[PDB]
Paper text:
Based on the CqsRp-ethanolamine structure described above, we hypothesized that substituting Asp198 for Asn would disrupt Asp198 hydrogen bonding with ethanolamine without disrupting protein folding. LC-MS/MS analysis of CqsRp-D198N showed that it contains less than 2.1 ± 0.2 μM ethanolamine in a 103.3 μM sample of protein, and we then determined the X-ray crystal structure of apo CqsRp-D198N to 2.50 Å resolution. Since substituting negatively charged Asp198 for uncharged Asn resulted in a dramatic reduction in CqsRp-ethanolamine binding affinity as determined by LC-MS/MS and the absence of ethanolamine in the crystal structure, we conclude that the Asp198 negative charge is critical for ethanolamine coordination. Importantly, ethanolamine, L-alaninol, and serinol did not bind CqsRp-D198N. In addition, while the CqsRp-D198N crystallographic asymmetric unit was dimeric, the protomers were anti-parallel, which is inconsistent with a biological arrangement. Analytical size-exclusion chromatography of CqsRp-ethanolamine and apo CqsRp-D198N showed that they are monomeric in solution. In contrast, CqsR-D198N was completely irresponsive to ethanolamine.
The canonical V. cholerae quorum sensing circuit is controlled by four histidine kinases CqsR, CqsS, LuxPQ, and VpsS. In V. cholerae, ethanolamine binding to the periplasmic domain of the receptor CqsR controls quorum sensing and infection site selectivity in the host.
Numbering used by the authors: 46 to 109, 118 to 127, 132 to 139, 145 to 234, 238 to 259
Write the structure that this text describes.
Amino acid sequence: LALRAELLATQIREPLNNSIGVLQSLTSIGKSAADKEEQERMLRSLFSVVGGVIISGGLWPEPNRYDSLFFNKAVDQLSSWNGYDRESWYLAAEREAEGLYFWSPVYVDPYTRVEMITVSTPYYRNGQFAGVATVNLSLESLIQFVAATAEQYNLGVNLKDAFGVEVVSHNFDNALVSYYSFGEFNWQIEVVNA
């Protein structure tokens, strides 16, 4: 249960760290001093990754009016938002040190209509704040992945955000439990044998 929970956290940190990887690619594109055209070309490619936990995401430059490059995977570039400058995820990252990542709570996107978590980071150009990159992670994609991984280790699992919020619950009585906090983000798993 101990080592088995450690190997589960390892296998669950893969899509999360790869969410950071994509987000770092978004930041580089925002810092690239690129015209909107080429940017659309590259952002469609980056999201063209097959499957995964990411459902949508894009770039959100400082207003002044609005020029957000948002994309969703159903890939179709979205139109609305153009404001996003007053959105929780936007503000948490506005004019923050480049390289910091902010995980939002679980919420329902009004536009795309998906239960998700929004990780946000700022990108800079010429030592000036330029915008915010975001990556939206589908809760259903994260749930099926964690459920299939734990069940393959013959375990029940309860993963929680740093918010201590029940993100997923799978097969979780006199029983032993293992609490494993992992990652720069303060997520934890509660694991039993199933």
